[PDB]
Amino acid sequence: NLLEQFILLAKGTSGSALTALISQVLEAPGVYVFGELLELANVQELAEGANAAYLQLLNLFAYGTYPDYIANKESLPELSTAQQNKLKHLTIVSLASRMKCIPYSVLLKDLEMRNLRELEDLIIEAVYTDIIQGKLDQRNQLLEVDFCIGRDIRKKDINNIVKTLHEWCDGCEAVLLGIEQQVLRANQYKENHNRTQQQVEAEVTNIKKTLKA
Amino acid sequence: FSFKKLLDQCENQELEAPGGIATPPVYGQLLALYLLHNDMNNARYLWKRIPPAIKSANSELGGIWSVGQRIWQRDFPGIYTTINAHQWSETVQPIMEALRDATRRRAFALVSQAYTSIIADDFAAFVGLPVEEAVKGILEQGWQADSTTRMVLPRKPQQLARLTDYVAFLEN
Amino acid sequence: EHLIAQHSAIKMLHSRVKLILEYVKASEAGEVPFNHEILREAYALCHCLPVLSTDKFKTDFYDQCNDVGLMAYLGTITKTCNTMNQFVNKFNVLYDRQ
Amino acid sequence: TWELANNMQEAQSIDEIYKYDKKQQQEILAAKPWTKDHHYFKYCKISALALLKMVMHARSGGNLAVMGLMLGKVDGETMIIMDSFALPVEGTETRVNAQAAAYEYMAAYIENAKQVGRLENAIGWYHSHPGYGCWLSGINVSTQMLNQQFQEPFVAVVIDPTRTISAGKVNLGAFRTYPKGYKPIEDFGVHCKQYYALEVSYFKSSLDRKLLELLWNKYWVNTLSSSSLLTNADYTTGQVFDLSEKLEQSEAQLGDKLAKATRDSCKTTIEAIHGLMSQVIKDKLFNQINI
């Protein structure tokens, strides 16, 4: 993949060339999840020195959304239009991850946009890049997403993932239990009916045995 | 919600008696409770049931029956005038406020349901006071209002077992 | 038959979800190496659990439930009538001549 | 415990129909109940294995026409068929003639089956109609005449391979015929008075049921994503219309059919409630997780 193609050059280099490489990665199309790039020790070693801003920018791209690049706009270096478009696409993906019907006003507020047409064009190009799949609806000012790619996961949120899966498992188990109970009752009911019918039959034929004298 | 227990307690107190006639206060309390629950037929038959001697012995029953007659004709403005005309004993004291609150709620619901625009005078007579409940109506619940003609515009405000029982019944 | 045929499929889905949860727990503990690609898909699968919680779906589901209830009413009302007919047929011979 | 009844060796009347009561068969053959009235057997029950064998033979025939035999028995008012056996016949898709090859083949296969342990006899024949519905032609009518008038226990089967493949449901058609003399709708053809139709039913053993359920078990996605009663709406509406007609006929008769109408209504209601139950279970399992 693209990350594999851009990852082997980051071993031997460090310093300005490394930061230029991460900038090129952030500019290259197709790359949207920066998991293995941040996992390298060379990237993490940038915290000490004069290149902490690039590390903060990479962390913001990996996990943060567009408003996070509002309070600390002056701290990070200038961004080109490709990086801004990629960040907006990541913010759209993050928003669609939570709710499946994104209102237009929420998107306009979140992406800091002034025109509805520009927002629709940005959503259209995001769909063309094939990061999310969905359809717009101007009558209700809604965007419906049927499937969105998961974003990056840090090594502290995994426990929460477990919780959700656990919940699902529990629910399945509950359903199973109910199933059993229901079918059992059904069977019993049927048996009861048959039994009583048989009893009646016995009675009447017994009557016959005592009436044909 | 606590009045239902008092209601049925008075019911079984009424049901049997040493001589078939009970004390005046229990009769009055039962009649007032019947009036409160907006059940007019039982209250009217209870009033018909009372013997004339005990009926004329106490004037409290007269006031209760006057209130019942006023509420039977569905004349809302007269109910508030006839409910406070006389004095009420402590035994029937906490009935009047509850009845007035229930009547006010019923009038509010009727106005909100059966009216799209009503003269402010009639609505204020229905509710009780033509000074501050109009501004309360427009502000608190957002009812539209217009001056000059004084017009308000109120607006109106465990599963699988059943299916398996149905299937078992149908199949058998 | 019906409540049991799909019970096996539900159990299979339970087993698959349990296997995925076991792998995620093992990755959290450290038995397996940190494959930072499967966890992203696990997160995406996690975020897609409350499927179609809109009002239109609820209204359609309630309409479907009411329609099936009415279809069952028309069909209980005829089994009751058939038992009614058999009862009157048996009654017209026992306690009433002809 | 979860399945409650399960199965180690126990069975029921479902597995009982697979047997050969020699005395019973001899006495029904000797008594000849159907020779006295024309309106005899109306229920034909054919096993699954025969059905799939017939379908594969028809498909292997392709655009042309194939033709084969069938094996079974008769029991009271009903007819039982549980074996299919193809024939090496060739011809144009509009006509097929059984040459000496089939004549030497049916006897040889019957002898081979008898050596195997099979005890059933010839019951009828199946012919594939590639496209032109399911109706007996003139030559088919004459052949069925002679077969049912010489070999009294018999029945013909006609299927449509092309329409079965295209639509998705089988075109099994079981037909018996009224003998000559008894005289008392364009789809059925032009000899609709000479030949009539029969209902079709199927059965499978306890072992067959278990194997089929366990094999179909590898369909879980479609099992819990089918959402029935949204695909068979036309079938249910047609069933309700036929229910209305049957109810009208029963009401006219009252002035029995009422039992049949009640059973049909019960079947349709059971299907509808089963669909609702599956929908409810899916909603409980999927839409009630993670708030």
Curated annotation (Swiss-Prot), chain A:
Q: Which residues form a coiled coil?
A: 179-213
PCI domain mapped to chain residues: 1-150
Secreted keyword on record: no
- Compartmental location: Cytoplasm; Nucleus
Output one GO BP term.
regulation of protein neddylation
Listed GO CC annotations: COP9 signalosome; cytoplasm; cytosol; nucleoplasm; nucleus
At the top level of its lineage, which domain of life is listed? Eukaryota
Keyword terms, alphabetized: Acetylation, Coiled coil, Cytoplasm, Host-virus interaction, Nucleus, Phosphoprotein, Signalosome
Family affiliation: Belongs to the CSN7/EIF3M family. CSN7 subfamily.
Chain's role: Component of the COP9 signalosome complex (CSN), a complex involved in various cellular and developmental processes. The CSN complex is an essential regulator of the ubiquitin (Ubl) conjugation pathway by mediating the deneddylation of the cullin subunits of SCF-type E3 ligase complexes, leading to decrease the Ubl ligase activity of SCF-type complexes such as SCF, CSA or DDB2. The complex is also involved in phosphorylation of p53/TP53, JUN, I-kappa-B-alpha/NFKBIA, ITPK1 and IRF8/ICSBP, possibly via its association with CK2 and PKD kinases.
Fill in the subunit field for this protein. Component of the CSN complex, composed of COPS1/GPS1, COPS2, COPS3, COPS4, COPS5, COPS6, COPS7 (COPS7A or COPS7B), COPS8 and COPS9 isoform 1. In the complex, it probably interacts directly with COPS1, COPS2, COPS4, COPS5, COPS6 and COPS8. Interacts with EIF3S6. (Microbial infection) Interacts with vaccinia virus protein C9L.
Task: Write down what this protein is called.
Answer: COP9 signalosome complex subunit 7b
Q: Which source organism?
A: Homo sapiens (Human)
- Summarize which stretch of the complete protein this chain spans: 10 to 222 of 264
Curated annotation (Swiss-Prot), chain B:
Q: Which UniProt keywords apply?
A: Cytoplasm, Nucleus, Phosphoprotein, Signalosome
Instruction: Please list the residue ranges annotated as the PCI domain.
Output: 1-157
Its subcellular locations are: Cytoplasm; Nucleus
Q: Which GO CC annotations does the UniProt entry carry?
A: COP9 signalosome; cytoplasm; cytosol; extracellular exosome; nucleoplasm; nucleus; perinuclear region of cytoplasm
The family database entries (InterPro entries) matched by this protein are listed as: COP9_CSN8, CSN8_PSD8_EIF3K, PCI_dom
What GO terms in the biological process aspect are recorded for it? activation of NF-kappaB-inducing kinase activity; COP9 signalosome assembly; negative regulation of cell population proliferation; protein deneddylation; protein neddylation; protein phosphorylation; regulation of protein neddylation
Where is it mainly found?
cytoplasm
UniProt lists the family membership as follows:
Belongs to the CSN8 family.
Provide the function of this protein.
Answer: Component of the COP9 signalosome complex (CSN), a complex involved in various cellular and developmental processes. The CSN complex is an essential regulator of the ubiquitin (Ubl) conjugation pathway by mediating the deneddylation of the cullin subunits of SCF-type E3 ligase complexes, leading to decrease the Ubl ligase activity of SCF-type complexes such as SCF, CSA or DDB2. The complex is also involved in phosphorylation of p53/TP53, c-jun/JUN, IkappaBalpha/NFKBIA, ITPK1 and IRF8/ICSBP, possibly via its association with CK2 and PKD kinases.
Q: Name it.
A: COP9 signalosome complex subunit 8
Q: Which gene encodes it?
A: COPS8
Swiss-Prot record, chain C:
Which region ranges are annotated with the description Interaction with Vpr?
1-98
- Signal peptide as annotated in the record: none
Subcellular location field: Nucleus; Cytoplasm; Cytoplasm, Perinuclear region
Tissue specificity here reads: Widely expressed.
| Function recorded in the entry | Component of the COP9 signalosome complex (CSN), a complex involved in various cellular and developmental processes. The CSN complex is an essential regulator of the ubiquitin (Ubl) conjugation pathway by mediating the deneddylation of the cullin subunits of SCF-type E3 ligase complexes, leading to decrease the Ubl ligase activity of SCF-type complexes such as SCF, CSA or DDB2. The complex is also involved in phosphorylation of p53/TP53, c-jun/JUN, IkappaBalpha/NFKBIA, ITPK1 and IRF8, possibly via its association with CK2 and PKD kinases.
Quaternary structure, per UniProt, is: Component of the CSN complex, composed of COPS1/GPS1, COPS2, COPS3, COPS4, COPS5, COPS6, COPS7 (COPS7A or COPS7B), COPS8 and COPS9 isoform 1. In the complex, it probably interacts directly with COPS2, COPS4, COPS5, COPS7 (COPS7A or COPS7B) and COPS9 isoform 1. Interacts with the translation initiation factor EIF3S6. Interacts weakly with RBX1. Directly interacts with COP1 and 14-3-3 protein sigma/SFN. Interacts with ERCC6.
What family does this belong to? Answer: Belongs to the peptidase M67A family. CSN6 subfamily.
Record's protein name: COP9 signalosome complex subunit 6
What are the leading ranks of the lineage?
Answer: Eukaryota, Metazoa, Chordata, Craniata, Vertebrata
Span covered, complete protein: 219 to 316 of 327
UniProtKB/Swiss-Prot annotation, chain D:
One GO CC term, this protein = chromatin
What Pfam families would the database entry show?
Answer: CSN5_C, JAB
Keyword terms of this UniProt record = Acetylation, Cytoplasm, Cytoplasmic vesicle, Hydrolase, Metal-binding, Metalloprotease, Nucleus, Protease, Signalosome, Synapse, Zinc
Q: Does the keyword Metal-binding apply?
A: yes
The first-level EC class reads hydrolase
Q: What is its EC number?
A: 3.4.-.-
> Which biological processes are named by the entry's GO terms?
exosomal secretion; negative regulation of apoptotic process; positive regulation of DNA-binding transcription factor activity; positive regulation of transcription by RNA polymerase II; post-translational protein modification; protein deneddylation; protein neddylation; proteolysis
Relate the assembly described in the record.
Answer: Component of the CSN complex, composed of COPS1/GPS1, COPS2, COPS3, COPS4, COPS5, COPS6, COPS7 (COPS7A or COPS7B), COPS8 and COPS9 isoform 1. In the complex, it probably interacts directly with COPS1, COPS2, COPS4, COPS6 and COPS7 (COPS7A or COPS7B) and COPS9 isoform 1. Interacts with COPS9 isoform 2. The CSN complex interacts with the BRISC complex. Also exists as monomeric form. Interacts with TP53, MIF, JUN, UCHL1, NCOA1, HIF1A, CDKN1B, BCL3, GFER, PGR, LHCGR, SMAD4, SMAD7, ID1, ID3, ITGB2 and TOP2A. Part of a complex consisting of RANBP9, Ran, DYRK1B and COPS5. Interacts with IFIT3.
* UniProt-recorded name of the protein: COP9 signalosome complex subunit 5
Record organism: Homo sapiens
Q: What is the lineage of its organism?
A: Eukaryota, Metazoa, Chordata, Craniata, Vertebrata
